[PDB]
Amino acid sequence: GVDMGVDLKDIIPGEAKTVIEDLRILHGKIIVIDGYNALYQFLAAIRQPDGTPLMDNNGRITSHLSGLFYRTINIVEAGIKPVYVFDGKPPELKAREIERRKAVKEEAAKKYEEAVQSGDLELARRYAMMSAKLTEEMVRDAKSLLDAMGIPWVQAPAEGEAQAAYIVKKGDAYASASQDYDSLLFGSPKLVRNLTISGRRKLPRKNEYVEVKPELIELDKLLVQLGITLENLIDIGILLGTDYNPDGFEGIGPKKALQLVKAYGGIEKIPKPILKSPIEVDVIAIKKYFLQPQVTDNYRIEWHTPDPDAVKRILVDEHDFSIDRVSTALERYVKAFKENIR
Template sequence: MGNAAFREIATIEAVSFDELSGVVAVDAHNWLYRYLTTTVRFTSSDVYTTEDGTEVANLVGVVQGLGKFFENDLVPVFVFDGGVTELKAEEVDDRREQRETYEQQLEDEREDADATRIAQLESRTQRLTDVIHETTRELLDHLDVPVVEAPAEGEAQAAHMARNGGVDYVGSEDYDTLLLGAPVTLRKLTSSGNLERMDFQATLEAHDLTWEQLVDVGILCGTDFNDGVDGIGPKTAVKKIHEHGDLWSVLEAEDAYVDRGDAIRSLFLNPDVTDDYSVDTDVSPDIDAARDYLTEWEIPHSAVERGLERIEDATAQTGLDEFF
């Protein structure tokens, strides 16, 4: 969710990995992008660039990031986006324009800027290309990590799976999962410290809101699909929803307008999702096949071997299938 201020009203608590176990539906785009940018920023480009110039930093990031799940009795299920909704197209265009600006800055400063500045700009210009999507799926297949293809938004599908008991948690850094009704969202899965546990029901109870009203609060503040109403932040939005009841009454009282408000509401309350998926928690990674695949993409052994060892050791020692 574009408006990070929504954190002001979300019920969030710090938790450690050892307090958790089960299955987490990971917003693949969100998780992968964070590891992609981190890898690019802190790793020499020679490590993840093939001889023909193809960049596959994602492969290093996947190997480095997966071990954390298995070492802590969590089975990740990566949920990939399907098509971009029409209402989100504008946000995608804005991000593309911002990335193009960073690319121009990188070109202008490459000769004169220091290594730190160049690394920062390179991380900001990363995009999830077709090659990155394709190679990520293939590597996850070798590692026997479950994948679900969403018909539209990956985080909407992940939230749907959690609401229907298909998984225990949703993994995402965005606050959209709260508006999508995900019972429990785990944030900071890519960080080195504690996680954050964001609780949907506790958030509703803390502010005496219904799910529909929480979505209305989000729309008033601004989402990926709309700009918020000027002067209204999360706490003010909650207050106004209490006073007037719903989005439309608040807009009338404020003499304000939200374009396609009904459609935005529906994207959160009735998103395009599917029940046509399966999650096999009996994970048995083929480490040799994964290693060979990484070699095919010219990833140096030294960059991924420790990560592969962590995955192999964790899945062998815990016997993940015994937990479910």
């Protein structure tokens, strides 16, 4: 999927992650899913055959709603009790997400150009795929859809990932779920990755597939295996770049950041020439914020009876989804809801 936050993928040791064979292993668990990250995953992963986003008859992108609908159904059918958490700020004002999007686009543009120049139509099509912007209206529609589906969501005061971590800390969910690792930095005991994108994706040749499986990462286990403190982990994130310093530090990737924090016991002792930043950054204040982020006790996670007609109105009437496909999915969803949620 797409990295919209702090990506630590290639520094996670094997001993710190557990491959989940399929969704059903997590049956009965409450999973708190970061809202913006999931919507970004759906925006990138759900496409027409040629790579164009799904669109309604008014020309509006619908990929995020399609993902949210069908993936949430699958999660429920697996026996998982999902709850989404949405950021206190609109997605237009999420500095790291915007910086991440810009970086992906710049990289894709360079690769598209190379593919055109080399005459590779297959790569061209891949690198041509546009990175859709998540807007406040799309977030509003996502919330409305979840309401119609009877799926709870929590309004975070600030970072969605921080609130997700806090819900897990409180024992109100088993794990947070996202493609980025932000929730671990915010102290989540358990992160599940790939939940929004798991399954089999068809490759170029006839019977070829890539298998993406969900994975569990436990915080205290990660910290021990890496031989680092939570403050060290947060500092790694700061070197890579947060909402409070979206560009991070020039030339520093995840392996290097990990090496540096370990060698100097944090950021402040790293020799100054190593760290190059466009603007001066209060790295200590950012760390202390990650340790005690703005989060709330003011939530109550409850699942309600799905409202099939309301789902139809949103997807079919307002967004031109197929009535057959939506109705068939709803039939299955209401049954699985009754059985798995109550």
